[PDB]
Amino acid sequence: MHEAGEFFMRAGSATVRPTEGAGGTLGSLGGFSVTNNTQLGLTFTYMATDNIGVELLAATPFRHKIGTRATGDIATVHHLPPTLMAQWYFGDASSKFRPYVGAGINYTTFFDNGFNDHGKEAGLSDLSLKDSWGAAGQVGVDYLINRDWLVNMSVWYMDIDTTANYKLGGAQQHDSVRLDPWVFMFSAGYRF
Template sequence: MKVLLPLALVATLGAIATPAAHADDNNWVVRFGVHAVAPKDNPGSLAGAQSSISSSTRPTASLEYLFTPNWGLDLLAAWPFQHDVKLAGLGKVAQTKELPPTLGINYHFMPDSVWSPFVGVGVNYTNFFDTKSAGALKGASVSIANSWGVAARVGFDLRITDRWLATADVRWINIDSDVKVNGTRVGKAAVDPIAFGLSLGYRF
């Protein structure tokens, strides 16, 4: 059920977008920029010790299809983010990388204005990989489970020309992942990061 629910949401969004597509030009917006991912301060306890996860900033790209002037379907991709995992009293015990592709639907309040705010909601799949142990856990096998979760977004577009625009956004992503050491579950990391982004977009 945990996997079927987000898949159903993606299918529903696709079904909404397809019949609403229109023939006007410039329905696509491609954006390139950076996002800083800041996990929440208290992601939970692992093996009885309070954990913390470092922030990471990486290049990102997104593609949005505007199937009406107000509504758009957006896919976010990124260069892998890298995080240090620390435990209270032990310091850094692991390092991991993650890719968080996010598909969402956005509502643009004033699409014909120079300044156009928007809100969005969607689904995220976070893939953790290349997880390595360190410090007190050096030599142990550490794994972090992949995660499905909801995502929310708020931001604005600033029109530069008819084709070019600048975008600032803030995303909240629900990421909850089981953590295992040598195959034994030691807790759940409720990462739930806030992602702050700036990008330059081109409409075509």
């Protein structure tokens, strides 16, 4: 059984290295400040029945502080470490490694801190950080180290969307926030 209903569990070794500029086109706006820490989790890949499967990466709880010029740090904010990365096998039959092209999607949901005197007392405003989906296209390759276990290697580039707004005393805000740091996805994989 090397396809369809295949269950393979891996490690959640996500090496994040935030230190880029702003985007990657020809603009500059939306500064951010997040701490790097997410190299101790676990991944779970499951195939349906067509060389296609979903990979769920879960690790420690993400926590950081707002680093925008708007206020310059003042409120708290936490995201969800649990992300879903789709995987699809493109052309396979006999090779030295087990390639796989897919797309990593960052599942962002659940509320967080940030509220204040008026915000908290108003159960709104301040929040900003809302749910979103950080889908990004990328490829991956797994080296067959052993016959009972292998190693999966993958990486990212830049592609994520995040909504920043809420109800400010009875208003509808909306701020575009993106945070796609240098996160490396690599770890061992085994049938599970």
